[PDB]
């Protein structure tokens, strides 16, 4: 299973790194999507990308690294693509899962969820784990307001694969 990593600043200043695990295992396609954004293996990706959309006690939402606002992104395959599955389910804090704008809308955006949300199941994509730096998803979300605008802007200074 993919290993990739993100290392984030808040304002001026590093956080730290958050690493991932990618369950190619049961989301190959999802997985695969979120692996090459991470690499930029494609020609474009999630480096110098924003959370542009963080909700304390709930979830940070990024990947919108065209419009950086929830409206734009794009996946690796060319056109939106559709929810592989949802076996994987929103148990707890630490979890990747595909932002969407219905069923199979899925492009670049996803969220590291910050608590269990339950009521996302089958709604949204679950395709990995945080693995290190939970502590650092803290420091995303302590930007965070009910409404959803950061604070302080989160960027994803650096980002890969291991």
């Not at 065209?66 to 630490?94: A, C, Q, R, V, W």
């Not at 949204?124 to 650092?136: I, Q, Y």
Request: charged share 25%; aromatic share 10%; glycine share 12%.
């Amino acid at each position: 299973n993919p290993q990739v990593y993100m290392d984030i600043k808040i304002g001026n200043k590093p956080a730290g790194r958050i690493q991932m695990l990618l369950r190619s295992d049961v989301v190959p396609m999802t997985a695969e999507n979120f692996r090459c954004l991470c690499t930029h293996e494609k020609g474009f990706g999630f480096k110098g990308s924003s959370f542009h959309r963080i909700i304390p006690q709930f979830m940070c939402q990024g990947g919108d690294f065209t419009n950086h606002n929830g409206t734009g992104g794009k996946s690796i395959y060319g056109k939106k693509f559709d929810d592989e599955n949802f076996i994987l389910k929103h148990t707890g804090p630490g979890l990747l899962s595909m932002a969407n704008s219905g069923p199979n809308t899925n492009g670049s955006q996803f969220f590291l969820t910050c608590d269990k949300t339950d009521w996302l199941d089958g709604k949204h994509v679950v395709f990995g784990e945080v693995t290190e730096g939970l502590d650092v998803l803290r420091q995303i979300e302590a930007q965070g307001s009910k409404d959803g605008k950061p604070k302080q802007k989160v960027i994803i200074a650096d980002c890969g694969e291991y």
